[PDB]
RNA sequence: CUCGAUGUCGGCUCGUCGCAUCCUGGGGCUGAAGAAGGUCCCAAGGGUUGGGCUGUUCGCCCAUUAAAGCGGCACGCGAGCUGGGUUCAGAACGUCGUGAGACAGUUCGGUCUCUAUCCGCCACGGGCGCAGGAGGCUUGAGGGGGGCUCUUCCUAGUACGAGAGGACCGGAAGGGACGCACCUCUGGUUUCCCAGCUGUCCCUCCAGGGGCAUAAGCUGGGUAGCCAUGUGCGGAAGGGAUAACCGCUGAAAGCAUCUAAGCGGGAAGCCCGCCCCAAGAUGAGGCCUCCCACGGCGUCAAGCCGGUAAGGACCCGGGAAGACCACCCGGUGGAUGGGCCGGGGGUGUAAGCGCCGCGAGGCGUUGAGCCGACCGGUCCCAAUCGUCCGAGGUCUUGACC
């Protein structure tokens, strides 16, 4: 019973699936739109593209910093169910080894290297 | 560096040695033969509860 | 994420996108040039011409790197540390500047100009 | 800091694994062996999992625990010698049990523990 | 205004248009195990239990203390004053309405025995120009002829975990009437999967 | 007193009281319009930042700040550090000296020990007791913890106002500092969780592994626990007495006065309200349930033995509780551990055979493989068997049967 049980439950309650979207993939830079908004309920299907970085897993989870070269390096981290989300579509490839936090990217990247993977 | 001052008599020495004190050893009889057995154990005789597997040679 | 003494980045009319702040402009007990805050500093880095100089202003907090945790559980981090220089009132320093969007900023609000100003990629 | 603690052991992880093994081995040899209180306890947990693969029974499994004990004689010795004998129960193939005395000089409480027939 | 509970675990949730985090309160439902009538204990109040751990295990006394107004077969019990029992059995399946403010407490997870380091704030001493104590150690303790000795009540090393305590206001967030559970966004006062209680006081004028 | 011995500076760390109170408020006063100053009496509540240079505390300077106080305790702190210091020999010169040597002129280095006995503080236990013997729930006299404050915004520029200038009532909002808990989330760890790697001796050559390459060789990530830089919360109300200071009713001073008389106003302070201890408060125990008034002994039986498993202790086995200990749940009519199993979350597609390349390896079966503390199943194993102690429960008075 206990924890596992009851809790599993309440969450199931609220989050339900984070909106069946189960497209994780390690690599894949990809793109989405979160409601993220302010100013006159300007909740905007805002879409950021980002090279897939990491994640938290259980009730509460999060599609991690996918780093995005904006013109400086900006990495974007976002909670998974987090009703906050609407569109979440992949573009990139779910490839590469050593598993996540492979910031190798954000760090010494270098477009070339980037592609080097 | 900090050698006390004297010794509050055997008196004290005791106070201490005293609360100290030496208790005794737990025991009942062999679930098998006789003598003293501390809770879960066997010995140079009975030696078991399900297969002496012990004693005599 | 924060700092007192600091080698920070900017990109306004900068002498150099870098100045060292003393501390936080908030509630007398600084300890955090924090995201979306306002604080104190002088220049560290050079400055071709520019009316900027090797002085000291105060201004407002951009980027950080160690958790931009928002109200909506919006989350982010840029491998960059920089804010925009202020002229008194706050009224920003330069005509433009190299950087972009995201809540925290506008949210602090007082600086809409920065707001519309740094938009696109970079 | 410390309190809520799992897998509880002494000496040094290398020393330990060292033992766990050496012992797991010697027992495998004799069915039953004599050592100190937890020596047994944990040794149980371990030689324990080993017999678990002993059972596993297959080219791979074999490959593994061998990975750990290093040496055919036993390798097979267990894997087929008794692994069958057990393959059918629900683990706990360990019988850890408190002897009659305590080693000298100290009074270190000891016992015999073995494959539980 | 009081709930008796088996504190579950802490977890995150969402509200309005934003996530935030809560905690899992669970309580079958204590019952009038004992009443201090006032003429009884002019410190008038209600004592209750809220579960049941094995019956084959149970002192006679317990058996009949229960006998009293007779109720069930548990062991979790305690008391609180100035709280009527407009019932003779309570659950919370409503007992505790959400969108309300609460106060609550519980057992306090059990620390260890760490000095100036733990126990109190300020992490020890310093480290380098001095290492015959490297980084931290005990502050100072009194003096020559001031009081002429060693003080009597400043913080101190050691055991500072095996105790109990509570938290002031917190939010009632949500009510799950079935599995007698409630999410409250709380300082998980003390462990979880263990013991706690809630009470509500706050004539607080903002 | 001290030379059978009292470590002097500066600083550190933990500070403790004090008011001639700095910020706080309460105030009468103004040369007080507002605002803002400034002028005294009341009141320590909390609070009473960073750096710079200087061995200097003082100090001067940078930036803020509500504010960034004076000082008591051998200018608190060596049995708790530090030791630049000035003050053992060096050597330095600058300076006296006929020179030996010297200068509270200076400058470079310059061997600070500490196994606690006492009373004292921090904790945790063993007694023996608060006259039945018991399992458990309480109420607190009395003691402890925290009581700050910004700036903005709310009523704000109608108070003042010729005009230039600025609101009490009061009301918000967030923040800093700080105290109390706590991991979901955020990030930190994770000596074995997983994964990659060189060198090397070993297995059996090949792979597939194995110890050593510092108490894990290297590296990249990594639960769970513990933990900030992450999260909730808190510093309230509000009740009653009052400080300065304001008044009512009223004489003695046949007009007057707050003034002994009698009544009221009033401070972030005092008692409470807030949490945390607590009858070893011998002045409780109050209530609940329950075994029997337990059984034998020289009357005074407040001694013995069984009495009760009334209950508990012992040993065992388990615990975010934990040095030991006591606390806490359990012992097989159980799930308590470990085991196993299902599952989470970890690693990042194994081992082999198979498919393209002279080869390097590449692709397939593979997101496989292998896994420690996290939810929980199932007696697979080990919680067997036993033992001992524990009413006939203070004195006293009154009442009933």
Neighbours of chain D (3+ CB pairs under 8 A): B, E
Contact E104, E166 (CB under 8 A): yes
E strands of chain B, at which residues?
A: 28-29, 36-37
- Helix axis angle for D13-30 and D72-81, nearest 10°, is 60
Contact C60, C41 (CB under 8 A): no
CB contact set of A57 (below 8 Å; sequence gap of 6+): none
Phi and psi at A64, nearest 5°, equal -75, 175
Closest among E81, E92, E74 to E47, alpha carbons compared:
E81
CA distance E10 to A60: 12
Contact C7, C20 (CB under 8 A): yes
Contact C79, A75 (CB under 8 A): yes
What is the DSSP pairing of strand C75-78 with strand C81-86?
unpaired
CA distance E177 to A13: 13
CA distance A13 to C28: 45
Contact E164, E152 (CB under 8 A): no
CA distance D3 to A52: 38
CA distance E70 to E75: 14
CB contact under 8 Å between A77 and C75, yes or no, is: yes
Q: What Å resolution does this PDB entry report? A: 5.0
Cross-strand partners of A58: A60
CB contact under 8 Å between D3 and E114, yes or no, is: no
Contact B20, B31 (CB under 8 A): no
DSSP E119-159: SSSS-----SS--TT-S------EETTSSSEE-S-S--SS-
Place of tokens 């066997």: B42
Q: Which two tokens stand for residue E195?
A: 């013991």
Residue of A nearest to E192 (CA): A3
Contact E24, E192 (CB under 8 A): yes
What is the DSSP pairing of strand E18-20 with strand E174-176?
unpaired
Q: Which nucleotides of F are covered by protein (CB under 7 A)?
A: 12-16, 49-50, 62-68, 72-74, 76-77, 79-83, 112-126, 134-140, 144-145, 150, 172-187, 191-192, 195-196, 203, 208-212, 215-217, 220-222, 224-227, 229-238, 274-277, 286-291, 310-312, 314-323, 326, 329-331, 333-335, 338-351, 367, 369-378, 380-387
């Amino acid at each position: 019973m206990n924890r596992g049980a009851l809790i599993k439950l309440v969450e199931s309650r609220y989050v339900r699936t984070d909106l069946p979207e189960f497209r994780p993939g390690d690599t894949v830079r990809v793109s989405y739109k979160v409601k993220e908004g302010n100013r006159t309920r300007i909740q905007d299907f805002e879409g950021i593209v980002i090279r897939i970085r990491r994640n938290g897993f259980n009730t509460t989870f999060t599609v991690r910093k996918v780093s995005y070269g904006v013109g400086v390096e900006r990495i974007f981290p976002l909670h998974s169910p987090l009703i906050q989300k609407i569109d979440i579509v992949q573009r990139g490839r779910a490839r590469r080894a050593k598993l996540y936090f492979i910031r190798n990217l954000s760090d010494r990247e270098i477009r070339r290297k980037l592609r080097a993977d | 560096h900090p050698v006390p001052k004297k010794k509050t008599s055997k008196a004290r020495r005791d106070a201490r040695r005293s609360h100290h004190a030496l208790t005794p050893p737990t025991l009942v009889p062999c679930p098998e033969c006789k003598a003293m057995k501390p809770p879960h154990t066997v010995c140079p005789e009975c030696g078991y509860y399900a297969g002496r597997k012990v004693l005599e040679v | 994420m924060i700092q007192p003494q600091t080698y920070l980045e900017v990109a306004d009319n900068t002498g150099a996108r870098k100045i060292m702040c003393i501390r936080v402009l908030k509630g007398s007990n600084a300890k955090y040039a924090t995201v979306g805050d306002v604080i104190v500093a002088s220049v560290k880095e050079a400055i071709p011409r520019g009316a900027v100089k090797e002085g000291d202003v105060v201004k407002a907090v951009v980027v950080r790197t160690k958790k931009e945790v928002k109200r909506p559980d919006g989350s982010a981090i840029r491998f960059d540390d920089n804010a925009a220089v202020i002229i008194n009132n706050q009224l920003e320093p330069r005509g433009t500047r190299v950087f972009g969007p995201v809540a925290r900023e506008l949210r602090e609000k007082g600086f809409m100009k920065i707001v519309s100003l740094a938009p696109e990629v970079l | 800091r410390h309190l809520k603690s799992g897998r509880k052991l002494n000496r040094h992880s290398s020393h330990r694994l060292a033992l766990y093994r050496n012992q797991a081995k010697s027992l495998l040899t004799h069915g039953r062996i004599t050592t100190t209180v937890p020596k047994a306890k944990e040794l149980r947990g371990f030689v324990d999992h080993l017999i678990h693969l002993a059972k596993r029974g297959d080219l791979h499994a074999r490959r593994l625990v061998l990975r750990d004990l290093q040496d055919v004689k036993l390798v097979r010795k267990l894997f087929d010698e008794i692994a069958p004998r057990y393959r059918d129960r629900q683990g706990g193939y360990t019988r850890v049990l408190k002897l009659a005395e305590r080693r000298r000089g100290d009074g270190a409480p000891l016992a015999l523990v073995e494959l539980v027939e | 205004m009081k709930g008796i509970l088996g504190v579950k675990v802490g977890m995150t949730r969402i509200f309005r248009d934003d996530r935030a985090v809560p905690v899992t309160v669970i309580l079958a439902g204590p019952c009038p195990v004992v009443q201090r009538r006032t003429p009884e204990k002019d410190g008038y109040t209600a004592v209750q239990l809220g579960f049941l751990p094995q019956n084959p295990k149970r002192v006679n006394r317990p058996l009949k203390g229960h006998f009293a107004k007779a109720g069930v077969e548990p062991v979790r019990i305690l008391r609180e004053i100035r709280d009527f029992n407009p019932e003779g059995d309570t659950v919370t399946v409503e007992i505790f309405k959400p969108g309300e403010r609460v106060d609550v407490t519980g057992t306090s997870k059990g620390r260890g025995f760490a000095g100036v380091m733990k126990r109190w704030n300020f992490a020890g001493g310093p480290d380098s120009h001095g290492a015959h104590k490297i980084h931290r150690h005990p502050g100072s303790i009194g003096n020559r002829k001031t009081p002429g000795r060693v003080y009597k009540g400043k913080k101190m090393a050691g055991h500072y975990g095996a105790e109990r305590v509570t938290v002031m206001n917190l939010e009632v967030v949500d009510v799950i009437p079935e599995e007698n559970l409630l999410l409250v966004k709380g300082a998980v006062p003390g462990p979880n999967g263990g013991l706690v209680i809630v009470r509500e006081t706050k004539k607080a004028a903002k």
